[PDB]
């Protein structure tokens, strides 16, 4: 926790000053190793809430938006959520996993959610290959 590779460690490689602190220029980029990479107008929007120089305790402030780390919504949190009981997952993604995960970060997609989709699939445990369902949901 208080050792992050790809946080504390990625954020000192984009140190240009070498102090722990770093411009909206290195955000955008040290943002893309953890998600994704927006424009210098986000950064810089960032800049107008936190200190001008965004250090470790800058950037890990905007973060950590809930206070800790598995809930901000890291891209890795969710990869390994799924893969806890998607080994292989050759047509079949397994719902009861899926939930398990995602109820406990939150009280996400609960049995009452994933009741409804198991009554509408014609499966046994919420398998479709998880296509079915980033299928409609990116298809709007």
């Known amino acids: 926790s208080t050792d992050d590779s790809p946080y504390k460690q990625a954020f000192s490689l984009f140190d240009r000053h070498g102090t722990g602190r770093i411009p909206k220029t290195s955000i955008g980029d ?3 190793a953890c998600g994704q990479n927006p424009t210098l107008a986000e950064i ?21 938006r809930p206070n800790g780390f598995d809930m901000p919504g890291d891209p890795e949190e969710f990869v390994k959520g799924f893969q806890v009981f998607d080994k292989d997952a050759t047509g079949m ?10 109820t406990s970060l939150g009280e996400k997609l609960s049995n009452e959610e994933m009741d409804e989709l198991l009554k509408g699939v014609p499966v046994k445990d919420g398998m479709v290959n998880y296509h079915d369902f980033v299928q409609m949901i990116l298809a709007n």
């Open 30 to 32: 040290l943002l893309r």
């Open 44 to 64: 810089t929007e960032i800049e107008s809430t936190l200190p001008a120089e965004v250090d470790m305790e800058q950037f890990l402030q905007v973060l950590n």
């Open 93 to 102: 993604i397994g719902v009861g996993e899926l939930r398990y995960v995602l």
